[PDB]
């Protein structure tokens, strides 16, 4: 999971 | 006159930008998983019946460029239009390769009096991206 | 006679105004994930905000961060519908 | 085990983002008399949702200003339904 | 599982915030028109059986008051909450009587986290104020 | 007619  | 109508000969357009690569010196992180969604589009928008173009990698000038040029086709056939942005963002903004663009900019173009074929029927945008940099902690339930 | 300008238009984000978004390396962004598999399930069926709404109850209840720093673990996401539509939308005549 | 701290929220705005909104001195707002209306009509029907597409309908093709102004003479207005909402809502 | 559940023994409140006069320092014109709203929203959710109040000339300060205090009510048995802000505006902010106030600091008062008793239920905002001073023309069809 |  990773942020944009 | 509730529902639009969506029996013209073409369902319309289904424009995918995937911006995966971006520059170094803009701060932005690769975007790992984004093809992934990029090929689950292109298919579902297939089923749908959409003319779907996937584009990657677009710097802001690119992405101004394509959206313009879309805006200019003739849509008198087409029911509708559909765009998805797949990249970077914050409020109101969406990241080209090599830097931010407006969101306002780019829809502009389909504004009721900029496109006229398709005025009276209805433009999607769907966008993946960050709007800001706040986390929602949740609740239990 | 006339029409507004911004009329017609609907914008489907993947997160409230504000807050990241979350994308798995893996299996794609949340949003996406969920949005193409409810137009898979129900585009022959429901209007399209009803799927959007599927769409919102799906990111909503089914994902949660998974991170080893604390800071951006357990965390959450809603969607945002904003729409601008004068009619409803379904994908099938 | 969680839901989002800002989901079950729908803002029903009268007017697109950046935009003026109407009210008649007489009539009352364009949003709210056309709000209204759909409500009496519907709300024993139709999902909430779908009220408020009517009600984006009615604002947008019903109602055109009419000023001395030229500047505000002649003007239009969208509504702009913003929903974090995750399910369907009927109030019957 | 798609339908928010709304036999609770109550629908819920119905807030009504009805700001017409305006104090000279914010330099807003009277509202002409919004008792008629105001009326009228009254009988429409009268009629779809919530417990409406009616609250008129609010400043600034009196609405965050106003908001604190309703989300720190028990609504363990309404099915849902509603609150209708009639005022001026601009983009992101509505006006109390004495000047601006943001929305975001009205409605996190409901946040899940924040509102227990209304954790799952639905959260309607209805909003008539401008949202900046932008005219939409048309175009016609 | 007015504005808000």
Known sequence: ?4 | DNSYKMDYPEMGLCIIINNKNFHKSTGMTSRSGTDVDAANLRETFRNLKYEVRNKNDLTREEIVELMRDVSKEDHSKRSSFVCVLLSHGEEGIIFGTNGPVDLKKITNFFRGDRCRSLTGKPKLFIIQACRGTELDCGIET | ?93
Chains 1, 6 share one sequence.
């Open chain 1, 1 to 4: 999971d990773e942020v944009x």
């Open chain 3, 1 to 93: 006679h006339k029409i507004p300008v911004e009329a017609d238009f609907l914008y489907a984000y993947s997160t409230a105004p504000g807050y990241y978004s979350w994308r798995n390396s893996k299996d794609g962004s949340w949003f996406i994930q969920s949005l193409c598999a409810m137009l898979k399930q129900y585009a022959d069926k429901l209007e399209f905000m009803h799927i959007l709404t599927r769409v919102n109850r799906k990111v909503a209840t089914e994902f949660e961060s998974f991170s080893f720093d604390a800071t951006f673990h357990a965390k959450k996401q809603i969607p945002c519908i904003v729409s601008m539509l004068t009619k409803e939308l379904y994908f099938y005549h």
